[PDB]
Amino acid sequence: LTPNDIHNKTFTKSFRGYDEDEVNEFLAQVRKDYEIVLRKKTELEAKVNE
Amino acid sequence: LTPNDIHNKTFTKSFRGYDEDEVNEFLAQVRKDYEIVLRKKTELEAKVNE
Numbered sequence: 001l002t003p004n005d006i007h008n009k010t011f012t013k014s015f016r017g018y019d020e021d022e023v024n025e026f027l028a029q030v031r032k033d034y035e036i037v038l039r040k041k042t043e044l045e046a047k048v049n050e
Numbered sequence: 051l052t053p054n055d056i057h058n059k060t061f062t063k064s065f066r067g068y069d070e071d072e073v074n075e076f077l078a079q080v081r082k083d084y085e086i087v088l089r090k091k092t093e094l095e096a097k098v099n100e
Contacts, residue, residue: 001083009076010068017067026059030080033051037087044094 003038006031053085 006027011017056077 001080006080011072011076012069014067014069015065016063017069018061018073019064019067022061023068023073026061029051030056030077030084034080034084034087037084037091041087041091041094044091044098047098048094 001034003031003035006034051084053081053088056081056084 008024009027011023059077061073
């Protein structure tokens with residue numbers, strides 16, 4: 001998965017499904033922390049190279 | 051977040067919510083991908099430390 005795949009991700013509507021705003025809030029936290037690790041990995045690859 | 055935080059997260063239910071199975075399956079995929087990138091980042095840091 002890429003951060004773009006997480007961004008604004010939606011799911012099928014369901015009665016008594018998980019609350020939409022709480023799931024969308026949580027996916028903003030997941031997207032942020034996944035992009036933090038991917039950016040660090042990019043940084044460390046470049047240091048390896050140099 | 052840690053990968054296990056993503057598995058452990060709960061959400062309240064709503065009249066119009068998101069399908070639980072679809073959310074849980076997506077978060078299982080993000081957890082697995084996140085734990086792999088964290089491992090790769092940790093390996094790279096060691097390759098930079100060495």
